[PDB]
Amino acid sequence: ATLKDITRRLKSIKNIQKITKSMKMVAAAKYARAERELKPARVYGVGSLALYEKADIKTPELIIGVSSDRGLCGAIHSSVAKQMKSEAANLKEVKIIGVGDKIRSILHRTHSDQFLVTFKEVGRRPPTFGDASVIALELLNSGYEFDEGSIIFNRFRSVISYKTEEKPIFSLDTISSAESMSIYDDIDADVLRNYQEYSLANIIYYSLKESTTSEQSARMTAMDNASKNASEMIDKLTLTFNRTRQAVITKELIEIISGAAAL
Amino acid sequence: VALVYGQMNEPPGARARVALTGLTVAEYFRDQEGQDVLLFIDNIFRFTQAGSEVSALLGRIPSAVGYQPTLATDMGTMQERITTTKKGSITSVQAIYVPADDLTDPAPATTFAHLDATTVLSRAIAELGIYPAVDPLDSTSRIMDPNIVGSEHYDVARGVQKILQDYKSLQDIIAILGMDELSEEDKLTVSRARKIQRFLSQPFQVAEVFTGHLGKLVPLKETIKGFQQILAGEYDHLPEQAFYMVGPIEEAVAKADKLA
Amino acid sequence: QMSFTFASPTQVFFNSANVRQVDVPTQTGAFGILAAHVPTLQVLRPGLVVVHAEDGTTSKYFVSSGSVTVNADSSVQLLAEEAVTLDMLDLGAAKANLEKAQSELLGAADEATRAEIQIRIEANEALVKAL
C-alpha cells in the first residue's frame, strides 16, 4: 500500500474502465442491428433446414466451427472449440474448418495437421450471404469429398444467454440419394447437385448470422461487467488511498513528537 | 452587507478569530433587531487551519492528521452560535475546501457534522450555459423530507431529479447509437428533462448591470408549480429555449410566443 | 391449406401462410405448386413468383435464384438469394444492362468467362418480362 503504487493502479484502471465502457456501447449497437437482421435469417435458415427434418437423412459408411477474430466476449470461442475437440475425438476420418481466426488459434495446435482452411475478417463487419458463399465455394473447391459434416456455432437466445449447437451437413450429394428421398420424384441426379450446393451456403449463412448476434451480445455483457468491476475497484482504491494518506501523516508526526519529547 | 476580513498575511490568531467577529456582527441583526441574517464564512477550511496554527504555537500535541486536539470543540463553539433563536436566526453559507480530495479527512469530516445542506457549483453545468450553475443531483439538503417540506414539495423535487437522472442514462446512448431507438416514452423523458434543465436556470438581479436582462426572484409556490406542470406534461408542446433564463413558468409561455 | 414460406437471406415475405397457389421459376420451366402437390425439389432461375392469396388479386415478386421445396406434408418453402417486388425495379437500367452483357460475350473466348457473361445475360433478360 504505497501512495505511489495505489496511484499507479488507479491510473491504469481509470483507462480500462473508459476503454471498457466504450467497447460495451459499440457492441450493444452492433448487437441491436444483429438481433434484427437475425429475425429474417432464422426463418430463412430454418427454411433451408425444412426438407431434412421434414424427412429423414442419415448416412452409410468435416467439422466446421464458427465464431470470430475478436476476443473479450466471454466464452464465445472456447465453447465452440470445446465441443469441436469433443467431436474430433469421439470420431471415420477427421477434417476441420474454422471461420474466425480465434478458432484457428484455439482448437488449433493439437489439430493443425487436421485443417483444411481457415477464415479471417469475421465479426468486424456484419456477415453476409456473400461471405457464406465464399465459405461454401472454398469447400466445394477443396479435395475433401466429405461424406458427412457438422457445423458448430452459438445459437442466440437472449442478451444473457446463448447455446453452442451443431447442425448436420449431409451435403453428401451421395447421401441425399437414400430411400427416404424416394418420396420426391422427378429429380435429376444433378438437379440435387445444385440443390445441395445451395442449401450448403444457406446453412453456413445461418450459423454466421446467429454467431455475430451471440458474440455482440456477449461482448456487450462482458464489457458491462468489466466496466462496473473497474469502477468499483476505482472507488475502493481511492478510499484505500485516503486511509493510507492520513496514516502516513499521523505516523510521521507521532514519530517526530516522540523524538522531541524524549529530550 | 458588512464585510469582515482576515487576510492571509495576518497571524494565526487573527485568521483564527475573524470568523467569530463576523459572527458577532450577524448575531446583532438577530438578537437586537430580530432579523434573519445571512452569515458567509469564506472559507470554512481556513478557519480550522488557523485553529491548528494557533494550537501548535501553544505547544499542544496535534491529533490525527496533524490537526488540533480541540478540532471538534473549536468548531462547535462557533457553529452552534448559528441558529434560529426565538428572537431571529443566522443562516450560514460556508465555503468548503476539501483537503486531498479526501472527504474523510478530519477537517472536512468534522465540518459535515454541522451542515444541513450543500450547494455544489458545477463547471459542467455552467458549460451548458445553465446558470446558476448549481448541480441538481449533487447538491443536497437535510430538510428534503416530506415530513418537513411537505409531500407536494418533496414529490416534485424527487420528480425533477429522477427525470434528470434517467435522461443522464440515455445521454450515453443518444451520442453513440443515435437518438432514435427512443420510445414514445424515452423521447418524452428527454424532452421534458431538457426543458427542466433549462427551467432550472435563471436571471439574477445582481447581474443586470451586465446581462442587460432583468433579474427574477421566483417564489417557492411558483417554483413547485412550475416544475409540477412540466413533469405533468402541461408544456410538452412548448419548445426548450422557451424555458431558458426566465422566472416563473408564465414567462416560459410568453417567451414561446415571442419565439413564434 | 398449405403453409407457404417465402424469403431471402435478408427479407421474409411469407411465413407458414395459407395460400391457395404459387408460381415459381425453375431450371425446367415454371412449376405451379398447388395446396396439394407431390413432393419435389427444384433449383430456381431468374424469373417471377406469383402468390395467389386467399382473396383474389394475387401479389407478384421477382427472384434471382435460390430454391423451392414441397414436402410430404402440405408445407412449401421458397428461398431466393434475392427477391424483390417489381415495385422497386427500373426497367430502363435492365435494358442498358442486357446490352453491355451481350457485348462482352462478343469479346470473350474463355469458356468460363463466357459462362459468367451468359448467366448475366439470362438474368437481365428475364428482367424485361414483368417490367
PDB file of N, CA, C and O in Angstrom, chain B residues 132-159:
ATOM      1  N   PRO B 132     -28.040  29.932 -12.474  1.00  0.00           N
ATOM      2  CA  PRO B 132     -26.928  29.435 -11.690  1.00  0.00           C
ATOM      3  C   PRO B 132     -26.581  27.980 -12.027  1.00  0.00           C
ATOM      4  O   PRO B 132     -27.433  27.125 -12.261  1.00  0.00           O
ATOM      5  N   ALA B 133     -25.268  27.767 -12.089  1.00  0.00           N
ATOM      6  CA  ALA B 133     -24.612  26.526 -12.389  1.00  0.00           C
ATOM      7  C   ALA B 133     -24.633  25.493 -11.261  1.00  0.00           C
ATOM      8  O   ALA B 133     -23.723  24.651 -11.148  1.00  0.00           O
ATOM      9  N   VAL B 134     -25.660  25.533 -10.421  1.00  0.00           N
ATOM     10  CA  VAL B 134     -25.840  24.591  -9.318  1.00  0.00           C
ATOM     11  C   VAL B 134     -26.121  23.201  -9.884  1.00  0.00           C
ATOM     12  O   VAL B 134     -26.805  23.080 -10.902  1.00  0.00           O
ATOM     13  N   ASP B 135     -25.609  22.140  -9.289  1.00  0.00           N
ATOM     14  CA  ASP B 135     -25.873  20.778  -9.777  1.00  0.00           C
ATOM     15  C   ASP B 135     -27.102  20.222  -9.063  1.00  0.00           C
ATOM     16  O   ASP B 135     -27.155  19.990  -7.849  1.00  0.00           O
ATOM     17  N   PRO B 136     -28.174  19.987  -9.782  1.00  0.00           N
ATOM     18  CA  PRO B 136     -29.436  19.483  -9.285  1.00  0.00           C
ATOM     19  C   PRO B 136     -29.424  18.070  -8.722  1.00  0.00           C
ATOM     20  O   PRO B 136     -30.396  17.624  -8.055  1.00  0.00           O
ATOM     21  N   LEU B 137     -28.362  17.305  -8.999  1.00  0.00           N
ATOM     22  CA  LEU B 137     -28.299  15.933  -8.497  1.00  0.00           C
ATOM     23  C   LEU B 137     -27.212  15.806  -7.450  1.00  0.00           C
ATOM     24  O   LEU B 137     -27.318  14.897  -6.629  1.00  0.00           O
ATOM     25  N   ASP B 138     -26.215  16.686  -7.464  1.00  0.00           N
ATOM     26  CA  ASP B 138     -25.160  16.568  -6.468  1.00  0.00           C
ATOM     27  C   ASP B 138     -25.434  17.428  -5.254  1.00  0.00           C
ATOM     28  O   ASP B 138     -24.978  17.056  -4.165  1.00  0.00           O
ATOM     29  N   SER B 139     -26.149  18.528  -5.427  1.00  0.00           N
ATOM     30  CA  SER B 139     -26.443  19.395  -4.272  1.00  0.00           C
ATOM     31  C   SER B 139     -27.422  18.744  -3.311  1.00  0.00           C
ATOM     32  O   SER B 139     -28.348  18.076  -3.799  1.00  0.00           O
ATOM     33  N   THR B 140     -27.249  18.929  -1.990  1.00  0.00           N
ATOM     34  CA  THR B 140     -28.207  18.232  -1.120  1.00  0.00           C
ATOM     35  C   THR B 140     -28.735  19.043   0.046  1.00  0.00           C
ATOM     36  O   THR B 140     -28.235  20.133   0.285  1.00  0.00           O
ATOM     37  N   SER B 141     -29.722  18.495   0.762  1.00  0.00           N
ATOM     38  CA  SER B 141     -30.317  19.155   1.907  1.00  0.00           C
ATOM     39  C   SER B 141     -30.942  18.198   2.918  1.00  0.00           C
ATOM     40  O   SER B 141     -31.632  17.230   2.580  1.00  0.00           O
ATOM     41  N   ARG B 142     -30.721  18.513   4.194  1.00  0.00           N
ATOM     42  CA  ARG B 142     -31.273  17.658   5.234  1.00  0.00           C
ATOM     43  C   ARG B 142     -32.793  17.771   5.294  1.00  0.00           C
ATOM     44  O   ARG B 142     -33.446  16.741   5.509  1.00  0.00           O
ATOM     45  N   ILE B 143     -33.331  18.970   5.084  1.00  0.00           N
ATOM     46  CA  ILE B 143     -34.752  19.204   5.150  1.00  0.00           C
ATOM     47  C   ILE B 143     -35.572  18.739   3.965  1.00  0.00           C
ATOM     48  O   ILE B 143     -36.769  19.052   3.889  1.00  0.00           O
ATOM     49  N   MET B 144     -34.994  17.969   3.044  1.00  0.00           N
ATOM     50  CA  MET B 144     -35.797  17.452   1.939  1.00  0.00           C
ATOM     51  C   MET B 144     -36.452  16.140   2.404  1.00  0.00           C
ATOM     52  O   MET B 144     -36.157  15.018   2.026  1.00  0.00           O
ATOM     53  N   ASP B 145     -37.396  16.377   3.309  1.00  0.00           N
ATOM     54  CA  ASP B 145     -38.192  15.337   3.940  1.00  0.00           C
ATOM     55  C   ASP B 145     -39.643  15.803   3.888  1.00  0.00           C
ATOM     56  O   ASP B 145     -39.928  16.932   4.287  1.00  0.00           O
ATOM     57  N   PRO B 146     -40.501  14.982   3.346  1.00  0.00           N
ATOM     58  CA  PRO B 146     -41.934  15.249   3.219  1.00  0.00           C
ATOM     59  C   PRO B 146     -42.459  15.660   4.593  1.00  0.00           C
ATOM     60  O   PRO B 146     -43.355  16.483   4.705  1.00  0.00           O
ATOM     61  N   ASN B 147     -41.853  15.079   5.631  1.00  0.00           N
ATOM     62  CA  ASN B 147     -42.249  15.423   6.981  1.00  0.00           C
ATOM     63  C   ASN B 147     -41.795  16.848   7.306  1.00  0.00           C
ATOM     64  O   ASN B 147     -42.020  17.291   8.435  1.00  0.00           O
ATOM     65  N   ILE B 148     -41.118  17.491   6.358  1.00  0.00           N
ATOM     66  CA  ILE B 148     -40.606  18.845   6.613  1.00  0.00           C
ATOM     67  C   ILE B 148     -40.956  19.812   5.498  1.00  0.00           C
ATOM     68  O   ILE B 148     -41.287  20.984   5.729  1.00  0.00           O
ATOM     69  N   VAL B 149     -40.877  19.345   4.251  1.00  0.00           N
ATOM     70  CA  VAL B 149     -41.194  20.264   3.149  1.00  0.00           C
ATOM     71  C   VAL B 149     -42.583  19.984   2.614  1.00  0.00           C
ATOM     72  O   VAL B 149     -43.156  20.720   1.785  1.00  0.00           O
ATOM     73  N   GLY B 150     -43.150  18.885   3.119  1.00  0.00           N
ATOM     74  CA  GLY B 150     -44.489  18.507   2.665  1.00  0.00           C
ATOM     75  C   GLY B 150     -44.388  17.682   1.386  1.00  0.00           C
ATOM     76  O   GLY B 150     -43.622  17.953   0.471  1.00  0.00           O
ATOM     77  N   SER B 151     -45.203  16.658   1.340  1.00  0.00           N
ATOM     78  CA  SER B 151     -45.292  15.706   0.243  1.00  0.00           C
ATOM     79  C   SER B 151     -45.226  16.309  -1.140  1.00  0.00           C
ATOM     80  O   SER B 151     -44.512  15.847  -2.047  1.00  0.00           O
ATOM     81  N   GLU B 152     -46.016  17.371  -1.346  1.00  0.00           N
ATOM     82  CA  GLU B 152     -46.024  18.006  -2.678  1.00  0.00           C
ATOM     83  C   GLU B 152     -44.580  18.408  -2.981  1.00  0.00           C
ATOM     84  O   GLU B 152     -43.942  17.796  -3.850  1.00  0.00           O
ATOM     85  N   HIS B 153     -44.080  19.389  -2.221  1.00  0.00           N
ATOM     86  CA  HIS B 153     -42.704  19.828  -2.436  1.00  0.00           C
ATOM     87  C   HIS B 153     -41.766  18.631  -2.625  1.00  0.00           C
ATOM     88  O   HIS B 153     -41.012  18.551  -3.594  1.00  0.00           O
ATOM     89  N   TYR B 154     -41.819  17.709  -1.669  1.00  0.00           N
ATOM     90  CA  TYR B 154     -40.980  16.520  -1.696  1.00  0.00           C
ATOM     91  C   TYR B 154     -41.165  15.695  -2.959  1.00  0.00           C
ATOM     92  O   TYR B 154     -40.180  15.220  -3.552  1.00  0.00           O
ATOM     93  N   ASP B 155     -42.403  15.519  -3.429  1.00  0.00           N
ATOM     94  CA  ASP B 155     -42.581  14.718  -4.632  1.00  0.00           C
ATOM     95  C   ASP B 155     -42.105  15.386  -5.905  1.00  0.00           C
ATOM     96  O   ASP B 155     -41.573  14.727  -6.814  1.00  0.00           O
ATOM     97  N   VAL B 156     -42.321  16.694  -5.993  1.00  0.00           N
ATOM     98  CA  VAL B 156     -41.917  17.405  -7.222  1.00  0.00           C
ATOM     99  C   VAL B 156     -40.404  17.252  -7.380  1.00  0.00           C
ATOM    100  O   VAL B 156     -39.892  16.809  -8.404  1.00  0.00           O
ATOM    101  N   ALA B 157     -39.738  17.628  -6.293  1.00  0.00           N
ATOM    102  CA  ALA B 157     -38.286  17.575  -6.189  1.00  0.00           C
ATOM    103  C   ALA B 157     -37.791  16.190  -6.592  1.00  0.00           C
ATOM    104  O   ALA B 157     -36.937  16.053  -7.467  1.00  0.00           O
ATOM    105  N   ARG B 158     -38.348  15.162  -5.956  1.00  0.00           N
ATOM    106  CA  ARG B 158     -37.944  13.801  -6.292  1.00  0.00           C
ATOM    107  C   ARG B 158     -38.356  13.487  -7.729  1.00  0.00           C
ATOM    108  O   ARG B 158     -37.903  12.490  -8.314  1.00  0.00           O
ATOM    109  N   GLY B 159     -39.237  14.305  -8.316  1.00  0.00           N
ATOM    110  CA  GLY B 159     -39.686  14.017  -9.699  1.00  0.00           C
ATOM    111  C   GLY B 159     -38.658  14.583 -10.684  1.00  0.00           C
ATOM    112  O   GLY B 159     -38.228  13.977 -11.660  1.00  0.00           O
TER     113      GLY B 159
END
